[PDB]
Amino acid sequence: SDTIDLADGNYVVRRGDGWILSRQNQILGGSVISNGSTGIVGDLRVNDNAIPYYYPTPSFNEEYIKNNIQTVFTNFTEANQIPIGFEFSKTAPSNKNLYMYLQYTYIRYEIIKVLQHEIIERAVLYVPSLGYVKSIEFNPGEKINKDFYFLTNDKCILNEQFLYKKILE
Amino acid sequence: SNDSSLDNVNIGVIDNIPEIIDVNPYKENCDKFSPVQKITSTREINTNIP
Ligand SMILES: [Mg+2]
Numbered sequence: 001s002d003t004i005d006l007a008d009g010n011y012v013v014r015r016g017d018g019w020i021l022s023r024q025n026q027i028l029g030g031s032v033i034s035n036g037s038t039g040i041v042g043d044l045r046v047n048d049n050a051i052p053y054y055y056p057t058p059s060f061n062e063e064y065i066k067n068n069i070q071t072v073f074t075n076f077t078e079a080n081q082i083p084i085g086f087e088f089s090k091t092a093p094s095n096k097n098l099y100m101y102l103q104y105t106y107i108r109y110e111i112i113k114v115l116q117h118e119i120i121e122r123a124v125l126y127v128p129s130l131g132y133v134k135s136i137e138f139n140p141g142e143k144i145n146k147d148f149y150f151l152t153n154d155k156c157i158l159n160e161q162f163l164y165k166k167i168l169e
Numbered sequence: 170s171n172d173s174s175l176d177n178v179n180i181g182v183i184d185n186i187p188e189i190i191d192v193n194p195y196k197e198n199c200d201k202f203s204p205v206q207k208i209t210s211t212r213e214i215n216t217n218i219p
Contacts, residue, residue: 077187081187081190
């Protein structure tokens with residue numbers, strides 16, 4: 001993306017909830033249920049799995065990103081010490097096998113620099129919000145689409161947001 | 170016995186550890202504080218050579 005309708009300076013941007021990272025889909029594991037059973041896969045966001053992932057730039061180091069995001073948006077340092085659980089339940093049809101795999105969702109924050117109404121620098125923070133599972137019913141030896149398993153680029157499973165605030169000097 | 174003991178103290182990681190909020194107290198964690206008293210004795214010794 002390029003040439004936004006914003007004045008020059010630095011901005012904190014919230015991109016919304018429901019961001020899943022590339023190549024990270026099945027790293028959490030999967031469950032195979034069958035023949036009328038119900039599978040429940042879930043997690044508890046506490047401690048190490050709640051640690052956010054940083055991607056800084058020369059102008060925007062880790063501390064700049066963290067402090068600006070927490071000043072404007074939800075304070076994730078305090079809120080990630082309180083455990084929060086989530087779960088997904090799916091029922092297999094009779095005489096058939098179902099596969100379900102889980103991957104975390106992230107809040108995507110951006111620190112952008114606008115110079116003459118064109119974004120010249122962008123740093124990105126992913127804060128672990130919750131999870132998201134995908135399921136499919138399969139036959140022995142059936143081919144599965146490559147899109148169900150693998151993700152090429154980071155994408156948002158929901159509608160993307162763009163909530164900007166100018167960082168004051 | 171090198172003149173270096175605090176090398177394994179990493180200030181960054183320690184500063185990243187959140188504070189202890191929800192304390193589950195252990196009931197009997199202390200003793201009755203017993204003060205220590207001292208009587209100072211004085212000897213009185215005589216001498217002819219200073
Ligand atoms: Mg807050």
